[PDB]
Amino acid sequence: AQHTESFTSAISATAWSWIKVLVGGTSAFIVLGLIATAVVALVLFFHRH
Amino acid sequence: KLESDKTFPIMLNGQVNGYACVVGGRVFKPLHVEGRIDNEQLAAIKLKKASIYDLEYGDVPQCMKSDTLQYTSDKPPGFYNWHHGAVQYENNRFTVPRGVGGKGDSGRPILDNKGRVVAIVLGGVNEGSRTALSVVTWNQKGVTVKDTPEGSEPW
């Protein structure tokens, strides 16, 4: 071989897109749950008195 | 005074440590207090948990739905009847005279003149010549809200 392979060599810009959408979805659900906790803990802990 | 029957005590190691009260076809009981309600039909129901109000609440079964208290959030300041006596409501605070109530009086409904419950007592703090009650009430909009004067100690 005339070149050196690296770990991020075989990712083919759709596999990148897939790990992007996967991590984005995972983080999005988690962060949505966090914002849900925020809003419930805001309207309930405060803002009922 | 006469409607106080529908609150029934809980038994913990054989002694009464609190009371469970039925309102709106829903039986309630403070979380902090442990035991089994002293009657059979209400002993059965799996009581769901509400930590943020310190209240276990359950759906009273069928055949005594019409045998329960009513409640409103309409609470003008003034004197309101309660098991041991009157409770004066003022400056958005329920307060009973000094020394009355204590350990074991948790879950005790506080009624108004017309028998409608205004709050369930969960604790207290003795301030000066009075003692203010930490209760669970319903606000002007009528959603449930725990009201705690600072330093309330559970009963």
Sign of the dihedral defined by the CA atoms of residues B95, B96, B101, B104, in that order: negative
Sign of the dihedral defined by the CA atoms of residues B62, B63, B68, B71, in that order: positive
Method in brief: cryo-EM
| N-terminal to C-terminal alpha carbon distance within chain B | 21
> Other C-beta atoms within 10 Å of B53: how many?
18
> In the beta sheet, which residues pair with residue B121?
B135
Q: Does A49 contact B147 at a Cβ distance shorter than 8 Å?
A: yes
Tell me how close the Cα of A46 comes to any Cα of chain B, in angstroms: 10
Chain A positions touching B143 (Cβ under 8 A) are 48
Q: What is the CA radius of gyration of chain B?
A: 15
Q: Does A48 contact B52 at a Cβ distance shorter than 8 Å?
A: no
CB B87 within 8 A of CB B110: yes
Tell me, in Å, the resolution of the deposited structure: 3.6
3-state secondary structure of B51: helix
Torsion, CA B2, CA B8, CA B13, CA B17, rounded to 10: -60
Q: What is the CA radius of gyration of chain A?
A: 21
Q: Which of B105, B106, B112, B134 is catalytic?
A: B106
Any B CB within 8 A of A44 CB: yes
Which phi and psi (to 5°) does residue B46 adopt?
Answer: -70, 115
Q: Active site includes B84?
A: no
**Cα B84 from Cα B17, distance rounded (Å):** 16
Task: Determine the Cα angle at B140 with ends B155 and B85, to 5°.
Answer: 40
Residue B24 backbone class (left: φ over 0; alpha: ψ -120 to 50; beta: rest): left
